Amino acid sequence: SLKAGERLMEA
Amino acid sequence: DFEVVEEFTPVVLATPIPEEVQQAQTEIKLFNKWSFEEVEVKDASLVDYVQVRQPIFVAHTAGRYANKRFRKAQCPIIERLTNSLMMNGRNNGKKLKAVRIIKHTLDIINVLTDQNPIQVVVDAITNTGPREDTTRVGGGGAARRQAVDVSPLRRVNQAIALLTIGAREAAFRNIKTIAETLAEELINAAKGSSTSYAIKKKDELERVAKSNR
Amino acid sequence: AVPSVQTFGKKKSATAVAHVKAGKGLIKVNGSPITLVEPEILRFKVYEPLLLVGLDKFSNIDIRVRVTGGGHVSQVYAIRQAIAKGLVAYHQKYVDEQSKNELKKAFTSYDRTLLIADSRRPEPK
Amino acid sequence: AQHAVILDQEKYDRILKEVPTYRYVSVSVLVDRLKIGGSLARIALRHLEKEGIIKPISKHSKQAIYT
Amino acid sequence: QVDDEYAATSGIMDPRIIVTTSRDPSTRLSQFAKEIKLLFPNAVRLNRGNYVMPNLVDACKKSGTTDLVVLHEHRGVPTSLTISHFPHGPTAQFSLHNVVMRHDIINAGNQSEVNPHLIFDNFTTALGKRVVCILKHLFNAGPKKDSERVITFANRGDFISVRQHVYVRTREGVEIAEVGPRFEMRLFELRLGTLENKDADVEWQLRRFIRTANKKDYL
Amino acid sequence: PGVSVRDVAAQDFINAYASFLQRQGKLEVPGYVDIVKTSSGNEMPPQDAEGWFYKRAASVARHIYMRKQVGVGKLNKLYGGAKSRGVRPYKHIDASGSINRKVLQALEKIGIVEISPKGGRRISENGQRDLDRIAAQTLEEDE
Amino acid sequence: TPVTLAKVIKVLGRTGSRGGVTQVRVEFLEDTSRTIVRNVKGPVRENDILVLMESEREARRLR
Amino acid sequence: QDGGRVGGSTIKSKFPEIVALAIENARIGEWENIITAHKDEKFARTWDMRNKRVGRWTFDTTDDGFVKSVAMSQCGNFGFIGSSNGSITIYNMQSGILRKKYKLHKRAVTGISLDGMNRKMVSCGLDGIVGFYDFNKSTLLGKLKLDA
Amino acid sequence: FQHILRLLNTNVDGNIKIVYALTTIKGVGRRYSNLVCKKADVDLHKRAGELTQEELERIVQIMQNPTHYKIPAWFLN
RNA sequence: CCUGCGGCACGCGCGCUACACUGACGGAGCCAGCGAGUCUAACCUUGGCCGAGAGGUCUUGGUAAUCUUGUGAAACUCCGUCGUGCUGGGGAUAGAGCAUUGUAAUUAUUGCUCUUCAACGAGGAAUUCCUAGUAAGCGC
């Protein structure tokens, strides 16, 4: 599970 | 052109203060020999962490440097080198032995390389402190060395550590004491001759960090 | 009578009773000149109140200092404390006030431990 | 008995024929293989008489003998 | 009814306590002060060396703590223990005989550290109620009805025996298991001042050398 | 312009006066003086058996001078060091009594000290002179 | 091998980084325009100058 | 204070007439605050304002020149004296002790001042030099020359 | 120079000081080896590979017969 | 080696010692704090004298901020000797003599003096204590 904010960036 | 007369009588005292001490009231000198003026940290990013601006007589400022996070920076590094000399159970809590070594060590660096001892000690710490250090990663049970950069306080802390350990280990079973081998370190670390302890051991820490980045 | 001023100086468990009176310029520690202090490396730790302000200001005064308690080092921090306090409390009494604030700003910029006792009272976290 | 000098009477030869060569300290003077039929550190001693043109260093002492 | 020293705080303010060690501790007992630091909540462990008992008391009333736990030892086996309530409160020097440190056993894990229930058994004497009200206030007030670790203080045969337990409740019975230290414990003197004072009024004192010394209980 | 022995550093004084009492030659070093260890927890006899008894008298004179009177039991404790008991802890032990008693009887013959009232030993007006004398000679060593 | 110094602007909080390693937006000293998100090892604050053996890599998370 | 007796004629005559006066009112009633330079005297006396009396200190020039101009610091601690041989002696005002002697001019100094901040100091000579001093440090800041 | 030599049935190593080369003999103290070099007027810091047999037996006459050379009786082994 | 726990040759826990030159040895420099101390008796004991020392002895001060005691403690400091050799590092094991406490010292009470001069060259897997006058060194 990715930490939030990182998963913004690759999305 | 212009003169200021500030002293009006020949200042003589009933208690005789010696000829080398009355001369020492113009500039403050380390161990009454070594001037803090004309001593430049020849590497930027290390000024504000190597503190040679405020001159000192002996390397024994007993002030509190442990309380704040970065209070450790303003220790005048000659003392900060003596503090890392008393690192062994045979040596903890004996500072006057360590100060007597440095005053004997700083003489040796003069006799060999005329320049200054204290310009060499500053130039030693600029060379041996690494520029990229490698850390361990988690990686899910299979750890690889991940290379990062290093804060300039750690660059000074580990630099001072490698010199005194490098002197304490090279003078383990030799007729050469701690005082002379440390002067063999700092002169070689000033040139970066790769024949000292710390210039070698930096050149793995910057070698390993290049391999995996 | 005789103009004197008595100041104290205190490190770990060592007192320092420095009588300062107008005189000729002798500076004694325990009935012995100040050029004969024991640890011999820290002798310049007690020349600090002599050499910071300038050795001219001791030309008219006497500094009788007697110390008990402490060790070898923690007496040297007591005689450098009571000479600095004994000098800067004679210029506010029997010499000029503007001398005192020149001294109290001189010892301050060098080392504040000369004047006020750095008391290392404990802390619980 | 036999002469109270040799091997070291040769060690004298190669001594003053190599000391001016290097030179350096007593840990370095340890070289050449220092043995009896004379003495260790004393080497530098009679070597303080003349000279050479090079360095040196002391232990319990403290010097940079320009021997 | 609670004791007169503990009366103002009793349920209102949580205690904050200090577990500290005698002087240059052995590495066995410096572990064992941490089990005391874990057996209570609100407990910090300050290593003692070149402190005096005045300036460790007097720099604790200042910072404000409820009480002070100091330990002693013989050759690694801890022997003694005192609890001393600070705002001129009482002290209780305990001798503790049968100890089993937690670090001996196995790497079973780590403790629950949640607020414990307590169990005080076999305290009948009025001096026994003093030891109740001086031990009970070392725990944070008002534990939950379903907290899972319970600390028993049992008094069979004048030796207050304290164990640490966790419990879970099955379909029929409670099943328990032991974590933390086993003590036997014995108080032997009870001052009305702190452990600093050394000339305060002695409320109780274990008399050994008396014709009826072995006869009575809580004597 | 005047000197007291207190104007001369401790060692350089007992150094030049212990070499004054050897060139003086009249002291009466007692019969043994090569075999004794000097103290309680000592190990070896003095490393210089030549000039030690004169080193020690030259100490003893500078010490009773500065004081009113000091006895034999007092010179022991001043000259006793710590004794290594080996595998047992170090503790303080007084030095050898005969030695310091035989510096006192032997400094009364050259008159550097005398029996005091109240007890002990005290510096004599003559020995107060000699000590002040060499306190100047040492003072003037500056050419 | 020219080395480019960099001045620290802002330490980064709440980023999930491996302990010991902290994450810092630096600013280039020789040209005050650019920024690069690098990681430090030792203790670092703002307004101190940091040494970069390589400029163009820009360090990501270290898990 | 010293104990030796004062040197002067026993038939008391008044002080010679006063050609330069300076007064700073900041510390009045505690020591002297009026410095006057008499006509043709190598010294220059002081006066307390509150007690209405000649002060106890007299200020000498130490180069045998006549006092042509005096000034005081705004703090009322320093007393300037401008000799007629360039020398600017700065006497303190508690004890009348000498502290600093400035030497820039060669002709007669004819006016001194100290700024409000006690930092910078000016002087003007009959040689045309207007010298600008620092006073915290003893450095000469600069030097200006006019015509007359 | 002559190396390893035999004194009182004991082989004495030549390249060391006589103050210490005599101490390899059984029982004789370090200070006892320090006194005999003083009594026999021998330099302390010489090596054992020196010391001609004239000066050897004078040490031997003192060491095997102490009490005729003002040696203190406690100072024996 | 000391000690505790097991076991009954050994297993375990707390510990002390040193492996040396940031040392040892010899002089010399010389600085703590908490403390205790004698009555119907023999306490803490200066000083003198005798003994290499350990100790002996003639006296003294003190029921004590008064006398011991400035407890002149030790690491520590300086100058010197040793010179990397199980060496002068280390002091176990042991021989012989002299003292002390005690009705009593053999299975050594302890101390002193000379000789004997071992393991130990930084300690496997394990694992203890610790954040500032603290850790560790050091003596009382």
Q: How far is H17 from chain C (nearest CA, A)?
A: 31
Burial per residue of H90-101, b for 16 or more beta-carbon CB atoms within 10 angstroms, e otherwise: bbbbbebebebb
Query: Is-cis flag, bond preceding D63, omega within 30?
Result: no
Question: What are the structural domain ranges in chain C?
Answer: 1-125
Q: Round to a whole number and report the distance in Å from the CA of F80 to the C1' of J110.
A: 21
Name residues whose C-beta falls within 8 Å of residue H116's C-beta, 6 or more positions apart in sequence.
Answer: H74
Alpha carbon of E213 to those of E25, E137, E159, E210: distances in Å?
34, 30, 15, 5
Alpha carbon of B50 to those of B80, B122, E81, H39: distances in Å?
10, 7, 49, 61
Burial per residue of H27-48, b for 16 or more beta-carbon CB atoms within 10 angstroms, e otherwise: bbeebbbbbbbbeebeebbbbb
Q: How far is I44 from chain D (nearest CA, A)?
A: 13
Helix (H), strand (E) counts: chain B: 7, 5
Pairs from B42-45 (Cβ < 8 Å, separation ≥ 24): B42/B122, B42/B123, B42/B126, B43/B126, B44/G5, B44/G29, B44/G49, B45/B152, B45/G5, B45/G48, B45/G49, B45/G50, B45/G51
Residue whose tokens read 């009272």: C121
DSSP conformation letters of H26-89: SSTTTS--EEEEETT-SEEEEEETTTTEEEEEEEE-SSS--EEEEEE-TTS-EEEEEETTSEEE
E strands in E7-126: 17-20, 43-46, 67-74, 77-85, 91-95, 117-120
Binding partners of B (≥3 Cβ pairs within 8 A): C, D, G, H
Q: Which helix (H) or strand (E) holds I56?
A: helix I53-64
Cβ of residue B194 closer than 8 Å to a chain G Cβ: no
DSSP conformation letters of G2-23: --EEEEEEEE--S----TT-EE
3-state secondary structure H52-64: CEEEEEEEECCCC
Q: Round to a whole number and report the distance in Å from the CA of B204 to the C1' of J43.
A: 71
Q: Which helix (H) or strand (E) holds C79?
A: helix C73-88
Chain J nucleotides reached by a protein CB under 7 Å:
3-4, 13-17, 20-23, 25-33, 46-56, 69, 72-78, 80-85, 87-88, 91-92, 95, 110-117, 127-140
Nearest to B149, CA basis, from G58, F105, H104: G58
- Across the strands, what pairs with G11? G24
Q: Are I34 and I44 in contact (CB under 8 A)?
A: yes
**Residues shown for chain D:** 67
Chain breaks in chain H (C to N over 2.5 A) after: none
Alpha carbons B24 and B20: distance in angstroms, whole number: 6
Is residue I61 included in any domain, yes or no?
yes
Q: Are E35 and E111 in contact (CB under 8 A)?
A: no
Q: What are phi and psi of B128, to 5 degrees?
A: -85, -25
Alpha carbons F128 and F5: distance in angstroms, whole number: 9
Q: Which residue range is the domain that position F75 belongs to?
A: 1-143
- What is the DSSP-derived secondary structure letter of residue I17? B
Residues in chain D with CB shorter than 8 Å from the CB of I43 are: none
Name residues whose C-beta falls within 8 Å of residue E199's C-beta, 6 or more positions apart in sequence.
Answer: E193
What is chain G's Cα-based Rg? Answer: 11
Instruction: Please state the domain count of chain F.
Output: 1
Residue whose tokens read 């190598």: H42
Give the side-chain half-sphere CA count within 13 A for F107. 34
Q: Dihedral angle at the C-alpha atoms of B128, B133, B136, B139, nearest 10 degrees?
A: -170
CB contact under 8 A, C97 and H92: no
Q: Are B130 and B199 in contact (CB under 8 A)?
A: no
Residue whose tokens read 């970069």: G52
Q: Round to a whole number and report the distance in Å from the CA of I67 to the C1' of J53.
A: 21
Provide the phi-psi class of B123: left if phi over 0, else alpha when psi is between -120 and 50, else beta. alpha
Q: What are phi and psi of G9, to 5 degrees?
A: -95, -55
- Across the strands, what pairs with E78? E73
Name residues whose C-beta falls within 8 Å of residue G24's C-beta, 6 or more positions apart in sequence.
Answer: G8, G9, G10, G11, G12, G37, G38, G39, G40, G44, G50
Q: Are F100 and F78 in contact (CB under 8 A)?
A: no
E/C touch flag: 3 or more CB pairs below 8 Å: yes
CB contact under 8 A, G57 and B149: no
Q: Which residue range is the domain that position I49 belongs to?
A: 4-69
Nearest to C78, CA basis, from C42, C121, C109: C42
CA-based end-to-end distance of chain C: 53
I44: tokens are 């302390």
Level-2 CATH architecture, domain D7-67: Orthogonal Bundle (1.10)
Given in angstroms, what resolution was this structure solved at?
4.9
- Across the strands, what pairs with C4? C21
Instruction: For the sheet with H87-92, list strands across it.
Output: B3-5, H98-103, H87-92, H78-83, H67-72
CA-based end-to-end distance of chain F: 17
Q: Which amino acid is at A6?
A: E
Alpha carbons D44 and D23: distance in angstroms, whole number: 11
Cα–chain center distance at F78? 11
Task: Please name each of the domains of chain G with its CATH number.
Answer: 1-63 (2.40.50.140)
Instruction: For the sheet with G4-11, list strands across it.
Output: G35-40, G22-28, G4-11, G49-52
Chain breaks in chain G (C to N over 2.5 A) after: none
Topology at the third CATH level for domain B8-213:
Ribosomal Protein S7 (1.10.455)
- Across the strands, what pairs with B11? none
Class of residue E81 by CB neighbours under 10 A (exposed 0-12, middle 13-18, buried 19+): buried
Q: Which amino acid is at B97?
A: K
Task: Give the CA angle between residues B78, B82, B86 to the nearest 5°.
Answer: 170
| Range C1-125 classified under CATH 3.90.76.10 | no
Q: Round to a whole number and report the distance in Å from the CA of F44 to the C1' of J106.
A: 34
Is residue I54 included in any domain, yes or no?
yes
Alpha carbons F123 and F69: distance in angstroms, whole number: 8
CB contact under 8 A, C121 and E55: yes
Residue whose tokens read 């660059």: B155
Nearest to B38, CA basis, from B111, B122, B134: B122
What is chain C's Cα-based Rg? Answer: 14
Cα–chain center distance at I10? 11
Give the number of C-H residue pairs with CB atoms closer than 8 Å: 10
Q: What are phi and psi of I59, to 5 degrees?
A: -70, -35
Instruction: Please state the domain count of chain I.
Output: 1
Alpha carbons D39 and I46: distance in angstroms, whole number: 8
Alpha carbons C64 and C86: distance in angstroms, whole number: 10
